Each structure stands twice: as C-alpha cells, then as structure tokens.
C-alpha cells in the first residue's frame, strides 16, 4: 500500500511522502526514510509565500524609480515587495506599474 496521495502540508515522491518546505523556505533535498525534507531560508531579497517543494525562492518585485514608482511595502520571505507611484500621478491599475 504505497500511499496514493499524501497529506496537506506534504508531497509525494516515488513510493514516499515528505513535508513541504515552509513559507520562507526552498527545497534543497527530498526526504529520506530516516531524515525529513531539507529546506533553506530565502535570504535578503527573495521570497516564497507558500508551503512548497520549489528549488528557488522568487525575486522581490522591482519598484522602479524611472517608471513613476517607489517602495510602498518592503518585501520579506513570506510576502513580496508592494509597489505604489509618486504623488499627483495615480497608478494605472491595482498592480501599479504606469502613472498620470
């Protein structure tokens, strides 16, 4: 009875079940029959917002001086940086890249 489907905060490789990595963490090495899934911190300016078996953390969005933009909220390992424009310019949508 190798399990068909695993548990909520765990994935399946081959015959065996493994914890996911936590938000703020990337997969390094899959779980063994002895040790559990080896994860790692995202570090300075990347983020990953989810229980994940991902090999790289995503890059904090670039909040771009020369498209009318600055850092609204600093990103962190769980979150992503959030972008908002400079003043008399209102943002062209929620996601906020263009500005008049």
């Amino acid at each position, epitope marked *: 009875e190798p*399990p068909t489907a695993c548990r909520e905060k*765990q994935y399946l490789i081959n*015959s065996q079940c493994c914890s996911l990595c936590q938000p703020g*963490q990337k997969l390094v090495s899959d779980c063994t029959e002895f*040790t*559990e899934t080896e994860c790692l911190p995202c570090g300075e300016s990347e983020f990953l917002d989810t229980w994940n078996r991902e090999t790289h953390c995503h890059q904090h969005k670039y909040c771009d001086p020369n498209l009318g933009l600055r850092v609204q909220q600093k990103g962190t390992s769980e979150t992503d940086t959030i972008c908002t424009c400079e003043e008399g310019w209102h943002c062209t949508s929620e996601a906020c890249e263009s500005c008049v």
Partner: antibody
Amino acid sequence: EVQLQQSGPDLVKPGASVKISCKTSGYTFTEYIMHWVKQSHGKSLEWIGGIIPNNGGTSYNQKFKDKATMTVDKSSSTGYMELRSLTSEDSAVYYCTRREVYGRNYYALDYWGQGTLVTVSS
Amino acid sequence: DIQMTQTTSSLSASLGDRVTITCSASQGINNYLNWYQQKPDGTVKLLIYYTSSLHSGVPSRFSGSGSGTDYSLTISNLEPEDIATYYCQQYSNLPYTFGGGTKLEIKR
C-alpha cells in the same frame, strides 16, 4: 492491537555476543522501519539505528557501527538486533520501535517495545 | 550530531497547574521533532510528532509549540498520572538524537 514483544532479559559474559528480538503484530511488518534505542540505567535514550524490511537497508549511529547489527526475518514478522564484542558499557535496556515508511506518520516512532535488559557480567 | 538540550532535569508542580518543558537544539531543526513520555516503569509512549501533532490516545492537555531552535511541551491541568520522564527527539539530521530528559513529579 499493534504490539512489539521483545525478548526477555539476558545475562552474558564480556567478549560474547547476544541477539535480542522484536516480534511485531497487528500490523504489516514491511510497511514500517524497525528502529533500536539504548538506555543505560538512569540516562537518556540513544538511537542505535534503523532497518527497512524490503531493501534490508540500514542506518547506524556511528557510536554503534562496530557494536550493532540489525536484521530482519520477513516471514515471522520479527526484527533482530545483535550486540557483539560485549563489555559492561553495554549493560542497558534496549528498546525497538517503528517508523511508518511511506510517511503517514511523518517521522514518529509511534509504538515502542517494552525493552530487553541486557546485563553483562563474569 | 545535533545536541538536544532539555534544560531542566526535573521539576514538580501541583495538580491542575500548567507545566512547560523546554527543548533547545544545538542548531535549527525546521520543526522536525517528536516528544516521548517514559513512565516510571520504563514504558515509552509517543505523545507528539512534527512539533505539535497529538498521537492517538493523548489528552487535549498536551501540546507542542516551537520553531527554529527552541521548542516546548506544555501540559495544562496537570493530572496525578502525568508523572513521567518527557524526552524530545530530532529527525532533521542523522543520527537521530534525544534530550537529556525532564522528570515531572507531583507536588501534593
């Protein structure tokens, strides 16, 4: 119920070997790793090692690489462990326990033996 | 080898108090930790696996917190039959290692 029935107590001389026996039931022998743990009188638990029934594959704490040998007999649904080259550092209780191998239980050692007291003496 | 320190060898508390038992690891273990309960007669039972999940029989009184390097077993409403030694074990890295033990007694 699930139960693990280790061998009764053994008195054995220095230099000798002894083999102790975990005998499982209420559960499928091959779906769980047999792990062995030591406890010297009034001390902590030490992990010796684990064995997987289908691979016959093994991990051994280095502290015990030259002491300990785990084996399995898939037919009687029974694990063995065999301590060799005995001295009195080895007089202790030895527990078996199990880890579900597919991962239903994470890395819970969930049901334990009652222990076998090895006493090592002239 | 990851050294697991249960910093309190023993402690006693009145029935119905909350007790917290502490386990720190020589380095981070990303929550990869179980808690065991050895009663005076030497029988060992699992209590809590993956930091905080109760095993089969265990009462609601029991609970595990922790993260990173520092973990806690917590028994709220202490009962006369909670007397045991509590042991934490890590599965982040081999060899699997255990805490020194924390023996819990009743004040009466």
